[PDB]
Design a protein around this ligand. Structure first.
Ligand SMILES: [Zn+2]
Length: 199
DNA sequence: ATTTTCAATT
């Protein structure tokens, strides 16, 4: 019987975790998956605060027989929970540290959703590159086949993510000078991977 | 500014 918090619900995302994950570093397990879907209303997009949430990419427990690693798969089961209707247009954008994924099994479930649900727009923000050995070339093309929407988080996205996921009074967001260099380095690699199709 | 990367098992 603990009294409810006055500052607000513990559903707030700590600023240290957001900065640590987005600290702009290569290699980071236990990544975090943030998602936010809104409903179009007569041309007016009304997002729902309750819909905004995040999932953990760390799920272990063979006792339940549950298999999965990337939180993206967990969110896949959340899609059917919302029961989105095809007659309406919904914009679901997922923000994760890495946009690329291996063909463990989640890359196939997401591809089926886009193929079965073409009336839905999926946009993923690539904060980091999780590729791998050279075989990663087909992996990116395999996911890009249905997810032809990959963009690197920009300075505005980082600031919007802080106030969108983090809301602490008296704690302002402090941008770091690394988006320009990281965006340019990742942008060259991101387009370079797709440029292979052009040739 | 930080250049080898999604903590599932046999
Ligand atoms: Zn995956």
């Amino acid at each position: 019987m603990e009294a409810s918090p006055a500052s607000g619900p513990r559903h707030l995302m700590d600023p240290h975790i957001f900065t640590s994950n987005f600290n702009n570093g290569i290699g980071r397990h236990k990544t975090y998956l943030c998602y936010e879907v809104e409903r179009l209303d007569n041309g007016t997009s009304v997002k729902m605060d309750q819909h905004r949430g995040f999932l953990h990419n760390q799920a272990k427990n063979l006792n339940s027989g549950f298999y999965g690693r990337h939180a993206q798969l967990r969110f896949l089961d959340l899609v059917p929970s919302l029961q989105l209707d095809p007659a309406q247009i919904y914009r679901v954008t997922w923000f994760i540290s890495w946009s690329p994924c291996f063909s463990w099994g989640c890359a196939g479930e997401v591809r089926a959703f886009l193929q079965e649900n073409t009336h839905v727009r999926l946009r993923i923000f690539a904060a980091r590159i999780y590729d791998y050995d050279p075989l990663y070339k087909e992996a990116l093309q395999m996911l890009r086949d249905a997810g032809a929407q990959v963009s690197i988080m920009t300075y505005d996205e980082f600031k919007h993510c802080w106030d969108t996921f983090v809301d602490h009074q008296g704690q302002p967001f402090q941008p770091w000078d690394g988006l320009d260099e990281h965006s340019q380095a990742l942008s060259g690699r991101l387009r370079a991977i797709l440029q292979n199709q052009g040739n």
